[PDB]
């Protein structure tokens, strides 16, 4: 059907992974990563830098896609396309916002009940950096319907 561009950006190290806990809006109460809508006018990747430095504080020496999700929200107009960043070149700290509070976890305690309920299946490809295709159909935001997701050579 008719979907929209997103961009998910994981902050993403030997050690640990930068997660931020929304105080208000989308996905509230859970260690999310940074992203948002792509822009006319910007490319995918140009979109991904920017919602990470808007919303974590945080400019990067380079990202690269790891993989793509596809997410249906059951009574939703649209289908949401999202392309997932990985980064470890940071050029400073993130900071809190109002928004959002920024956490170092380390990789093996990654909060997965405390984050979306999709992320348990497709984080242990993006910790392998293994690239992915993805499609999760959800019912409100904790019931996952179906699923795919599948390692490829190219996203
Ligand atoms: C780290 N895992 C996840 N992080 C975010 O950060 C929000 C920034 O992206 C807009 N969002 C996640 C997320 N895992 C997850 O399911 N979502 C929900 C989502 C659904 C549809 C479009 C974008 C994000």
Redesign the pocket.
């Given at each position: 059907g008719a979907s929209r561009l997103?961009t998910?950006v994981?902050v993403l190290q030997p050690q640990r992974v930068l997660?931020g806990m929304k105080k208000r809006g989308?996905?509230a109460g859970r260690w999310?990563?940074?992203?948002?809508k792509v822009q006319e006018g910007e490319t995918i990747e140009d979109g991904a830098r920017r919602e990470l430095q808007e919303e974590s504080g945080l400019t990067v020496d380079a990202l690269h896609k790891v993989g793509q999700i596809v997410?249906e929200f059951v009574g939703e107009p649209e289908l949401?396309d999202?392309h997932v960043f990985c980064t470890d070149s940071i050029q400073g700290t993130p900071v809190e916002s109002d928004e959002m509070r920024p956490c170092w976890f380390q990789l093996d305690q990654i909060p997965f009940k405390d984050?979306?309920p999709?992320?348990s299946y497709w984080f242990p490809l993006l910790l392998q950096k293994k690239k992915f295709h993805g499609y999760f159909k959800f019912q409100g935001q904790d019931t996952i319907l179906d699923y795919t997701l599948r390692e490829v050579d190219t996203v």
């Open positions: 997103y998910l994981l997660l989308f996905g999310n990563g940074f992203g948002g997410f949401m999202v984050m979306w999709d992320d």
